[PDB]
């Protein structure tokens, strides 16, 4: 009758060979490893909502949007009086480093950095404004411009 005993201990060690110890040990090693492949290198960027003054005079320097890999940054375009400025159109150069979404009516351009650091540029032709608002974007900065209020130099269709 002891054969049943040693045999069945052998079965308890091969059928379910993960001890209740070893199950939790495996689960916690998975947890640590996926924390390791989840932890961003160094200090992640600063999610900040800023507001820039857009000057279109010749010699003026273009506004800069700083991005984060895989994060939404929505640019809102603003006239001098505090009113929104809907978009007439836009051009994006290098569209595999930035992915753009926009409902064809509003004043919101929401960009993602499709790749970590290559910088590029966006031209945004506004409704009543002849000059394209032509801006520079750099991803992977030590801050991430969550949203930026472009206070453009002109006056929009809303007073």
């Amino acid at each position: 009758e002891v054969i049943d005993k040693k045999a069945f201990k052998d079965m308890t060690r091969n059928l379910y060979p993960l001890n209740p110890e070893q199950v939790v040990k495996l689960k916690q090693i998975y947890e640590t490893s996926e924390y390791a492949k989840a932890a961003t290198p160094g200090t992640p960027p600063k999610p900040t909502a800023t507001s820039q003054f857009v000057n279109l005079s010749p010699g003026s320097t273009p506004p800069v949007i700083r991005l984060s890999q895989g994060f939404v940054s929505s640019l809102v375009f603003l006239d001098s009086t505090g009113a929104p400025w809907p978009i007439a159109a836009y051009d994006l150069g290098d569209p595999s480093s930035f992915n753009i979404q926009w409902d064809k009516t509003s004043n919101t351009l929401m960009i993602q950095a499709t790749k970590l650091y290559n910088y590029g540029n966006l031209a945004v032709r506004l409704r009543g404004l002849n000059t394209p608002v032509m801006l520079t974007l750099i991803p992977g900065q030590k801050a991430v411009d969550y949203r930026v209020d472009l206070r453009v130099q002109g006056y929009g269709p809303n007073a």
Binding site: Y35, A39, T40, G42, T43, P44, K46
Partner: protein, 63 residues
């Protein structure tokens, strides 16, 4: 003074919420009013070691 408790913490940044309801965010080294500046953000333990000895940890109700 004003007491801040950890709101979220990851390797690097950490979002921190005070007793006045304000929300701010800290890195490896940055100025925190009252607590001076930070040396350590242990995200696995949820501990922030600062200058004058205070250690910031998840609110007792939020933890």
């Amino acid at each position: 003074r004003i007491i801040y408790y950890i709101q979220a913490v990851i390797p690097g940044r950490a979002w921190l919420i005070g007793s006045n309801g304000s929300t701010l965010t800290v890195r490896e080294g940055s100025k925190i009013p009252g607590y001076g500046m930070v040396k350590l953000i242990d995200s696995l333990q949820g501990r922030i070691l600062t200058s004058s000895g205070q250690v910031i940890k998840f609110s007792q109700e939020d933890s």
